[PDB]
Each structure stands twice: as structure tokens, then as C-alpha cells.
Amino acid sequence: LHHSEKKYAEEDQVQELLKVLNEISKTTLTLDPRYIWRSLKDLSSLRNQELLNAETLCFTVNVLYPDSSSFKKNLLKFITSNHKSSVPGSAELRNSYPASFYSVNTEKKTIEVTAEINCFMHLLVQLFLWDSKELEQLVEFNRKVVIPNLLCYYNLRSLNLINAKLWFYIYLSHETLARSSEEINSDNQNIILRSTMMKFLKIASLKHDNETKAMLINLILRDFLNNGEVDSASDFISKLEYPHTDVSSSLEARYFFYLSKINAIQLDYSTANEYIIAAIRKAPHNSKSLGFLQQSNKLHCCIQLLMGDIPELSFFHQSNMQKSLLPYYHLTKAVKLGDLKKFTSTITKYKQLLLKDDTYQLCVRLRSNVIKTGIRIISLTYKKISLRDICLKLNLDSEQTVEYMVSRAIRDGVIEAKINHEDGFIETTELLNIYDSEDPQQVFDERIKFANQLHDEYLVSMRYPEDKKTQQNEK
């Protein structure tokens, strides 16, 4: 029963291993093994549930174990394993073949097979752990082993993509352990984790690997947000080491998602408004990407309210995600109408929902945006309006309070008006008629630049996928 179960899944694993083994042996091809590893995550996740855990036991017995003898026993100890007589030395799939990792030349140490075998061995370990959701000692045991192993290897061009997906599980398993239980050792463990990310990122700068630095920057920028150091994130993004060429669309959307949150506290919403929009277009619309589109759209609605301009309300009702957008619907209504008591009562009941995403602190500063937007609305109504009539519509305190708020927004060019005290009304200084000025000409220049940029980007990849058609013999 259990004998035929281990031979079926192991044969499917070796079949996928021999495909990427011959591709890296001849010259250097990094494109083909990368496309297979994309589907490997989905095929292995479903396969780990079937045929239990016994598919990975004979794989370690097959190939030679540099470090991997005692690591599988520690993984099988937590599950209280019953003895099936799985002791190594029973099943032998090598049988002295060149593609089978010939044993005599391997045992004599005349050839080194450990490079591709050991780096691939650590990949299947983190996949089974993420399926069973194992924590505590098993998480710390892997972090201690992997770090010296990556420092010993020279990390060639093909070797940089093997551990590129392993760093994601290092930071993921550390955050799930802290949120599950808080202790004194969780803080000291994060100190070493910060130094490990920076040492490997600096080494990857010489190799100039596109996917390696893409996964690290996404994990490092998120670490600064949890640890709460802004000065580290400000200088980190100033170097601009993130390549835009071969990185995946899923990795690009995560990059622009962090820049919108960093610039949110810098009081510059001009550049932050573009990063949150570009992150939506780069993120897929599929079901697995719904988790990112849910959090990204919650930030976009908050940025527009911080800009003093009411965004388009059609995004809430037309989308199918409005169930989670209900708290943000009443926030825009309170800022637009300018009701003072409605805004205070909205953030009070929904404070629990806004605590998880940490957007409640930004809602505290929306209290100012309620009045600043209302002043902009009433200013665009009538060019000449009395001073005391403003306090009657918004139910303000006195005329001395509104006098400062109108002259406050004109510093950034918001209201664009003047207050006449001797006359008794506030006259708007905006006559429009910009058709005679040069201001629209500056915007028209940047629009054509976007056209010539896409034309050059159209030339980036055109003939490239067709380059292999001429060299390969056709009919």
C-alpha cells in the first residue's frame, strides 16, 4: 500500500528536476528554469496534501545528503511519526545512470553534485511547512541553517534564483510567529533578521539579478513599516536599485504600494497619487491577487481625501468589493457636506475596522480636511460672499476662527481668493481665462513624452521572442 505511494510522487518530482538540470548544464539559460518554477509552487502545494508526507522522505534517500539527514528526522519528530521501515538504504532509483547522479563517482568525491541538489533541497522544505503551518522551534531551526549555507556558496547567476523565493518564507514565518504570541525572544530575533537581509542584498548588487532584488526590497520596505523607522526607508529608496526590466508584474505592484504609504506622511501627495494608481494596473485581477487589490483600493480612497479634492464616487458602488468600502463611504460624505458631528460619530463606531489596516490614524487628520474642503466648496459657489454668512452655513464658532482658516489654504494655492475687511466680503481672485497663459503648455509637453516613451518601450520587446525562430530549424 504505502510502497507504491512513494514511487509515484517521487517519479513526478525527478521528472521535473531532470528538465531544469540539463538546461543549467549547457552554457547559461536562466529563462527556462524560471518559467517552470512558477508552476512548481502550485503543483507542489496540491501534491503535498496527497500521498501524505512520504513523498519527500525517499527523495532525500535517493540523492546524497550533505546536510539533509538529520533535518528530515526533526521534521518527522513533531508529527509523532510511526515507523513504516522507511530507514534509508531500501529504495534505490539511481542504479548507475548519468542522469541518475551516478553513485560511484559521487561517493568517491571526484565530482560535486551538491550544488544543484542542496540548493534545491531547501526549496521543498519550506513548501511542506507552509502547508502544515508549523511554528516555534521548527521556524527558528530553518533560519539558523539556511544563512550559513547561502554564504558558503558563490551564488552564481543560476544560483541566485533558487533562494530568491526562500527569503519570502523567512520573513513570512517570522511575522506569523510574532502575531501568534508575543515574548521577549521575538524582539531579539528580529534584530538578526534585519542584518541578514542587508548582507545578502549588498552581495546581489554585483550579480545584478532582477528577481533577487525584487523580492528583497518588497520584504525590506515592509520591515521598516512594522519596526517603525522612516529614516531607514527614506535613504533606502534614494538609491533606486530596483530593476524594472525582467521583474514580474506581481512584484512591481508591491513596490509602488510601499511608496504611496511612505509619501503619505511626507505631506507630498503629488507623487504618491501616481504610485497607488500604477500599482493597481500592474496587479492582476485574478482571485489570488484579490488580497492585494483589497488593501490597495482602501489606500487610494484615503489619499484623495487627504488631497482636499473629492474623488469619483462611482468606484464604490460599481465595484463588487463595496462590503469592505462601507466605512470609507461615510468619510467622504462627512468631508464633502462638512458636518462636524457626523465625522466624529463615523470614526467612533468604525474605529475597530480601521484599526487593523492602521488607517484610523490618518482619519484623525481628516478632521482638518472636513473644514478645508467645505471652505473650498463654498468659495467656488459665489465670488462675493459675506463673512458672517460663512459661519451660518457651517455652524462655526465666530468670525475670528474662519478668518484664519481661509487665509491658511491660500499658501498652497487652494482657495485662491482675497479677504476684504473694509468691504465685508471675500472676493475670489480666480478669473479663469488661462487660455492666454503658458500654463497648459507645460502639461501638454509631458503628455507627448508619454507617447514617445511607449514607442521606445514598444521597441524593447518586439523581435526578442522571435529571435529563436530563425536559429531553430523550421519546415
Binding site: 464616487l313 462611482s314 464604490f316 458602488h317 460599481q318
Partner: peptide, 27 residues
Amino acid sequence: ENWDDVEVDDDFTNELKAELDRYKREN
């Protein structure tokens, strides 16, 4: 649809007749 296409006003509905009443009385 959204904006005032749905919420509209929800005020001064039945009070429109009171505007003509106050004009023909206080006159």
C-alpha cells in the same frame, strides 16, 4: 450610479408645498 444619482436629497420633499403656503399667508 453614484453621487446624487442615488442619495439625491432626501430633504424638502413634502416641504415644497409649505413654500407656496408661506408666500400666500405672510403676504
